[PDB]
Amino acid sequence: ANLAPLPPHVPEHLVFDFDMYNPSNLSAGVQEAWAVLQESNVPDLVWTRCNGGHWIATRGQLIREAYEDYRHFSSECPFIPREAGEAYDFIPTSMDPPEQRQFRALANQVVGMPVVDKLENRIQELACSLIESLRPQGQCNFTEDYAEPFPIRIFMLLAGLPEEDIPHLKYLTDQMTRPDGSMTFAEAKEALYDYLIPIIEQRRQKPGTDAISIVANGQVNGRPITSDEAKRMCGLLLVGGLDTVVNFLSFSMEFLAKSPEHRQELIERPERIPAACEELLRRFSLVADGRILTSDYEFHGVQLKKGDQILLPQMLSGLDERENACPMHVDFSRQKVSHTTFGHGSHLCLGQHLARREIIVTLKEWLTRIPDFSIAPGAQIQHKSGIVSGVQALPLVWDPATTKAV
Ligand code: HEM
């Protein structure tokens, strides 16, 4: 890899060239690959020369800490590389309190608990339809057959966007989280905003009841939201809607496809599913963004310099043995599932209730109809890493004679 020149103020012993877009031991799994940052030979706060050079807090306590101190760690540049953090202007994430506060309130109206509760029937229906549709096939490509359509259509439904725009939209968000080099972030950004601008003006003239209409005609600071702000808020919703649960579902199903005992457990004790959901969210956490130093600052003995970027992997907190014993083992009965999978501080994920709902429904509905399944033989499952990690393909197979329509 191409390392960037070690800045003068960075100690050589703090260097650890970890590449968040292509971790060295990715073949062992993306979480495993990131967990190497937590080995004994790695300091708690290191500096990677990769992707332009930036710090990485490797421990749950430091990640939580930095996330709570927005005064030193600004959300103004939350992505690595720097070009990505700059071209990034999403709302409410590119804002630090108290500003993001109002915008966070409005985004909550469109994805908050009340919306989720109201959409629960639709969510349940879709899961049941998708699964009953596959149950007899005796096989499927989970990533394209379920993980993608289930959450995305629910989001398209909630946003009032045609399911026909999904391919184009999904490619653009994936470009922002796991860049393939085809275009810069600013370009993926633009392409995404190009799609929204007309829609926003449209729903501004003729407001509807969809999320985009609600956002576009919402109010912030006691006054109306601008088209720009509406667009920046919606760009983020698109990413959360098309590139989060979509990826997380595959990590969990890959796992269940190999854990017959874990499946049996939720089959018999469905009351355990919400706990299983939280534990899988810990073990298969997948997000990693960060902050930018607002000024020179000494953190846990390390001298941080104004302008310095620091990755605070939400993914690492719950994997930290200091936070959970035997962090790599999945135990649905963990007395306390500690994690920051949905973030920490003033930017706690607003779509986590929807995510949990979607996850719990999948677990229940899938295991009901298709209790016994496994990964297709010879299949090699591969992961991908970035601001949000995912799974390349997930071929599953099963005996329809063991399934059952409900
Ligand atoms: C498994 C699913 C998901 C995970 C793991 C996840 C994770 C995250 C994380 C870690 C943050 C904080 C980032 C930071 O502090 O810089 C965040 C913020 C946010 N997420 Fe999610 N998210 C998920 C699903 C969703 C969904 C489905 C939506 C729906 C559009 C969504 C909407 C948001 C919003 C609006 C914010 C901004 C909150 C703020 O800045 O105050 N997320 N998400």
Structure's resolution in angstroms: 1.7
- Catalytic annotation present for 349: yes
354 touches ligand 1 (CB under 6 Å): yes
245 touches ligand 1 (CB under 6 Å): yes
> Class of the 1-406 domain?
mainly alpha
Burial (CB count within 10 angstroms: exposed 0-12, middle 13-18, buried 19+), residue 380: exposed
- Hey, what are 47's tokens? 């500096």
Closest atom, ligand 1, to C-alpha of 346: 41
C-alpha to C-alpha distance for 194 and 210, rounded to whole angstroms:
19
Which residue's CA is minimally distant from atom 37 of ligand 1? 349
**Ligand-binding site membership of 50 (annotated):** no
CA within 13 Å, CB half, 55: 31
C-alpha to C-alpha distance for 154 and 141, rounded to whole angstroms:
19
- Catalytic annotation present for 128: no
What are residue 98's DSSP bridge partners? Answer: none
What are residue 290's DSSP bridge partners? Answer: 311
> How far is the centre of ligand 1, averaged over its atoms, from the C-alpha of 125 (Å)?
24
What are residue 383's DSSP bridge partners? Answer: 391
What are residue 15's DSSP bridge partners? Answer: 47
Substitution site in 253, 349, 353 for ligand 1 pocket (most atoms within 8 Å of beta carbon) = 349
Catalytic residue among 93, 143, 177, 244: 244
Contacts of 295-299 with C-beta under 8 Å, sequence gap 24+, read 295/72, 297/72, 299/45, 299/62, 299/66, 299/72
What are residue 48's DSSP bridge partners? Answer: 54
- Hey, what are 25's tokens? 């031991």
> How far is the centre of ligand 1, averaged over its atoms, from the C-alpha of 267 (Å)?
29
**Taking a C-beta distance cutoff of 8 angstroms, is the pair 126, 230 a contact?**
no
92 touches ligand 1 (CB under 6 Å): yes
Sign of the alpha-carbon torsion through 4, 71, 385, 170? negative
What is the 3-class SS of the chain, one letter each residue?
A: CCCCCCCCCCCHHHECCCCCCCCCCHHHCHHHHHHHHHCCCCCCEEEECHHHCEEEECCHHHHHHHHHCCCCEECCCCCCCHHHHHHCCCCCCCCCCCCHHHHHHHHHHHHCHHHHHHHHHHHHHHHHHHHHHHCCCCEEEHHHHHHCHHHHHHHHHHHCCCHHHHHHHHHHHHHHHCCCCCCCHHHHHHHHHHHHHHHHHHHHHCCCCCHHHHHHCCEECCEECCHHHHHHHHHHHHHHHHCCHHHHHHHHHHHHCCCHHHHHHHHHCHHHHHHHHHHHHHHCCCECEEEEECCCEEECCEEECCCCEEEECHHHHCCCCCCCCCCCCCCCCCCCCCCCCCCCHHHCCCCHHHHHHHHHHHHHHHHHHCCCCEECCCCCCCEECCCECEECCCEEECCHHHCCCC
C-alpha to C-alpha distance for 60 and 289, rounded to whole angstroms:
14
**Taking a C-beta distance cutoff of 8 angstroms, is the pair 116, 108 a contact?**
no
Instruction: Identify how the structure was determined.
Output: X-ray
Q: How far is CA 331 from CA 265, 327, 348, 370, in A?
A: 11, 9, 25, 22
CA within 13 Å, CB half, 286: 26
- Hey, what are 268's tokens? 């018999």
> How far is the centre of ligand 1, averaged over its atoms, from the C-alpha of 226 (Å)?
22
Closest atom, ligand 1, to C-alpha of 290: 16
**Taking a C-beta distance cutoff of 8 angstroms, is the pair 91, 232 a contact?**
yes
Nearest to 111 by CA among 173, 159, 77, 69: 159
C-alpha to C-alpha distance for 338 and 285, rounded to whole angstroms:
11
Q: Which residues have C-beta within 8 Å of that of residue 332, sequence separation ≥ 6? A: 262, 265, 266, 272, 275, 276, 279
C-alpha to C-alpha distance for 144 and 124, rounded to whole angstroms:
19
Sign of the alpha-carbon torsion through 352, 357, 363, 366? negative
Q: How far is CA 183 from CA 170, 190, 386, in A?
A: 15, 11, 15
- Catalytic annotation present for 350: yes
**Taking a C-beta distance cutoff of 8 angstroms, is the pair 136, 400 a contact?**
yes
**Taking a C-beta distance cutoff of 8 angstroms, is the pair 179, 190 a contact?**
no
Nearest to 185 by CA among 386, 344, 389: 386
